[PDB]
């Protein structure tokens, strides 16, 4: 009723890791989702990720639990909208809820042909002091203007599955193709399976689109205390490019990952 | 038409059952090509008659489908669904269900009637009739709210969203709203008859809405939304189906 | 290098009910890794030709990692020889494995109606030169070379860009198939051993059905043949019947 979409996602070994807890990988996925679909909601146009903020992970939902995703947008400029993302656990067999996520997120509204957007509606009070800590946190966002032997190459051929009916490659699909890399890279450093932490604020800086190659390059960036951190960079290729190997940088994301609470488990 | 299918994690569910859902999406697919085998042309799913689960599937074991053309009529046309689960140890099958459905077809054009040999073919032929009466005579806890957006892989080649994928997410949504009635895992009972009244396309956001009705009775709510119509609020009402469950 | 890498961890989804990856996954990997390598040579779509012998050395388990690297060997004119190296680690004691060393051949699809004309691979190595060799030799040999019903409806995941459906995807379905027959002869799950070359004969595209048949062929104890057919249908195609032979594969199994 209040332009909040709501997603609710039951964890089925499909969306699994190897430790029966739900792919990190698939979460952002659908934190993408959601939000996008909060943006084309206001909108009426098909909307791609501009930037992520920084997300924390509480909590890392098990099998057999169920999640819920609640998107808004929080402020409307003038391509692009603030999304705000809350994302909540609860145990079918407990009946306990617990936080897993608050986390922002920005969204670009992409022409029809060869356009403004309406002010979003303000209600209650949190409506009112988030609609100014929107452009306090976008001023963050745009000052962000700053442009280990256990490396990791992968690479996905973007099919029609992985964008929009325009043909756009989804943010949250190469979130979650990031991710996947991530993982095999600081396993490269634990003696446990290590859970995602933290994704670093990025900027998606530039157009994937259907029959795209992304190569995901992945490296141990630091280690501090129980974690590790691990950059990932992201470039693209259409069928020529890729022949003549000039590609194009899509972005760069840091991800912090967890050794099982124990530093023990890192070397 | 035959489609066999072994059941793995993929399929599965968190106790390692296979997924009702995953299941109504196999027998939509079959169904689908029985329909497509006979028109020429692409098919839809027009409605769904009574399903019921007869037993319950686990990973390791295998689901061999079949699926036939009863009658065509003028534009529709009635399959009929089987439905055996094998154990890949022991050798034993058993049935999971006998259920029909009706297909439309979508012309970019008549359809002819099928090829009639056994005695057991008159006698269904015969028997669709009543059933397609049957069919046009429906003619009056806490809400899960969730969304879904309708990729290329969820509809056929000419951009129509598969009827299965439908009832496939409409078992996701309405599993939960059951699970949070005895704060347990339950399982799918039946599907009751139901029609989808309009198209849906690729791009289209699918809204699901399960409530607890009443042995539980979930009500899901299907209403899709253009990216236009999804900003004006003004959406398209697919359809509502009642699915009971068992804990 | 030439090398076109990819890395794969193996989830749950990837699985089997005994906790292994999927042959059909491997495969359909494998099928990537040298079509994307193909691709980096040609600079157009290129389509599965044929694949040579692969054996599996080693079956991985859930929690490990896959690594792929795909090379061109040599290209001819419309075709290309890749080689194909694929080993496993894993995720927590580090140890890694070969998998399987094997040869896939890719065709260079036009887009329009053009003459396509590969240029030569850039030879570096003294090994680069024995293989530029070697795979005239196997081209030759290329050139010179109960039962379970199924059906999969090809969609847009299961095709490139222009819609031709990947050889890959042909082979995961292959097996899957393959898999029922193998179980319903022996009552136990049994596991892939290794894949007798064959060739792709028509292409497939997006909204066609694929009709799979499979039987046990010969059985040597301890080991089982199974024969699979692949058969595709236009929609108009499907309703009369008339359809065309994708390809004929040899898979053997094991108890
Ligand atoms: C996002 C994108 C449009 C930014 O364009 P740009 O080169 O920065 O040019 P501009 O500065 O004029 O950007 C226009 C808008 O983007 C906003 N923007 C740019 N960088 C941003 C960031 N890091 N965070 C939030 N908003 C940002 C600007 O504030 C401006 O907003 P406004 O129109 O409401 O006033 C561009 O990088 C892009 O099209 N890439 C991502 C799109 C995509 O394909 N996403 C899926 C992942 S591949
Ligand atoms: C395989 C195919 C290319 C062969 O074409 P053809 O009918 O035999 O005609 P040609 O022999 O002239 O084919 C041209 C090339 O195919 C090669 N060829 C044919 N079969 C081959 C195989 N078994 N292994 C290696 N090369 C083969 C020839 O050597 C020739 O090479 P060149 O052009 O570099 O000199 C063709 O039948 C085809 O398009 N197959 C299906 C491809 C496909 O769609 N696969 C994806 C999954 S269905
Ligand atoms: C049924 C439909 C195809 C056409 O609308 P309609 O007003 O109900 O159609 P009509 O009754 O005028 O005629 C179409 C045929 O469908 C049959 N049909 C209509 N309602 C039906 C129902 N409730 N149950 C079974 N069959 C039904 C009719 O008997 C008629 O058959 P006929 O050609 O042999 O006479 C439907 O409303 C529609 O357009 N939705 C298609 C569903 C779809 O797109 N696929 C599923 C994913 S959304």
């Given at each position: 009723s209040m332009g909040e979409v709501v997603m609710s996602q039951a964890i089925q070994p499909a969306h699994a890791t190897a430790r029966g807890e739900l792919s990190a990988g698939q979460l952002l996925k659908w934190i993408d989702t959601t939000a996008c679909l909060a943006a084309e909601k206001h909108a009426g146009v098909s909307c791609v990720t501009a930037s992520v903020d920084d997300i924390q992970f509480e909590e890392t939902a098990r099998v057999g639990q169920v999640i819920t995703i609640k998107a808004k947008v929080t402020r409307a400029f003038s391509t692009s909208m603030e999304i705000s993302i809350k994302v909540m656990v609860q145990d079918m067999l407990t009946g306990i809820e617990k936080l897993v996520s608050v986390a922002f997120s920005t969204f670009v509204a992409k022409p029809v042909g060869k356009i403004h957007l309406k002010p979003v509606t303000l209600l209650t009070e949190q409506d009112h002091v988030e609609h100014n800590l929107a452009a306090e946190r976008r001023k963050v966002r745009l000052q962000?203007?700053?442009?280990?032997?256990t490396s990791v190459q992968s690479i996905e051929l973007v099919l029609?599955?992985?964008?929009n009916h325009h043909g756009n490659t989804f943010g949250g699909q190469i979130m979650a193709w990031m991710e996947t890399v991530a993982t095999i890279s600081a396993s490269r450093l634990c003696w446990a399976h290590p859970f995602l932490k933290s994704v670093d604020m990025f900027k998606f800086r530039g157009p994937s689109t259907v029959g795209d190659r992304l190569v995901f390059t992945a490296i141990v960036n630091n280690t501090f205390q129980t974690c590790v951190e691990v950059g990932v960079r992201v470039e693209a290729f259409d069928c020529q490019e890729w022949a003549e190997g000039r590609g194009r940088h899509i972005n760069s994301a840091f991800l912090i990952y967890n050794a099982a609470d124990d530093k023990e488990n890192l070397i």
């Open positions: 962000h203007e700053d442009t280990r032997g029609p599955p992985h964008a």
